[PDB]
């Protein structure tokens with residue numbers, strides 16, 4: 001049931017999503033090893049992901065969380081980068097999309113920094129980089145990230161390096 | 162997939178060394194996220 005609707009670059013929704021992407025780039029401690037060396041992106045396309053069943057699944061859980069947390073879903077917009085991006089948009093997030101070895105246990109990980117999610121686009125550690133050139137810092141190949149609506153509810157705070 | 166710590170719905174990883182880093186978050190049920198925008202891009206070589 002998924003359809004993708006292109007946003008025009010003139011559209012203010014395009015512009016605000018692009019600004020969140022660009023403005024949350026930072027330098028990483030691997031010096032670019034996983035995700036490449038860059039200070040900004042060339043944005044080629046932004047598309048709205050529409051799937052009624054997946055949206056209703058999300059809003060249903062959101063309501064449950066909110067009723068467990070004094071009517072506060074604690075909803076954020078966050079980035080996700082994944083080799084499985086094409087299955088996520090058609091079938092939704094599930095346990096197949098979890099970072100089993102992540103530092104907070106087996107769950108599905110999201111970032112405020114777009115450049116952190118960019119490190120997982122070709123796999124954990126950036127995998128072997130782009131399929132065409134095997135280059136984790138490929139400047140040619142087109143990458144995709146998700147900008148996702150995420151219900152955190154009552155979040156457990158873990159201080160960490 | 163693991164479970165949220167008892168009484169919580171997610172985990173927040175607060176950056177605690179690198180003062181430039183923003184937070185990262187984990188959810189333990191797929192239904193707590195909706196993939197709203199698909200962004201196609203290239204990273205750009207610094208000049």
Ligand SMILES: O=c1cc(-c2ccc(Br)cc2)oc2ccccc12
Pocket residue numbers: 079080081082083097098099100109110111116117118120123124185186
């Ligand atoms: O965007 C993310 C994707 C993933 C991710 C995606 C797929 C797989 Br397999 C493993 C990790 O991990 C992250 C870890 C911290 C912050 C963000 C991310």
Ligand SMILES: [Zn+2]
Pocket residue numbers: 130131132133134135138139140141
């Ligand atoms: Zn390439």
